[PDB]
Design a protein around this ligand. Structure first.
Ligand SMILES: N#Cc1cc(Br)ccc1O
Length: 119
């Protein structure tokens, strides 16, 4: 019932995501020089370095907030892709499946810890 355990669990999951080749297009903000119309479609850019920095600065209160930012990386990729068959979008789908498979226990354990704290 450790209410703080999610933070190191998220740090370790972000480390795995950074080791994965599929994360390369998402490790840093999208390059506006390569994609000059990016901000005409995407209102809120997000990337894994920003997620990691926000976590390390102590600026997430819960793993749900981290999960909302990670999911924004994937929805941005889906909204900017010109095709559902594109390379970068295809990498986003595999990364998303891996992230969701691993974040599920983090969220469940945190929510269970909070419910126990308030019993
Ligand atoms: N992150 C990540 C990831 C992990 C495995 Br296993 C396979 C594909 C991926 O995109």
């Amino acid at each position: 019932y450790d209410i703080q355990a999610w933070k190191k669990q998220c740090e370790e999951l972000l480390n795995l995501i950074f080791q994965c080749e599929d994360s390369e297009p998402f490790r840093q903000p999208v390059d506006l020089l390569e994609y000059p119309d990016y901000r005409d479609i995407i209102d809120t850019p997000m990337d894994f370095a920003t997620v990691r920095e926000t976590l390390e600065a102590g600026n997430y209160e819960s793993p749900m907030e981290l999960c909302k930012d990670v999911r924004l990386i994937f929805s941005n990729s889906k909204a900017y892709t010109p095709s559902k068959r594109s390379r970068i979008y295809s990498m986003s789908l595999r990364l998303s499946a891996f992230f969701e498979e691993h974040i599920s226990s983090v969220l469940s354990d945190y929510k269970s810890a909070l419910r126990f704290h308030k019993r």
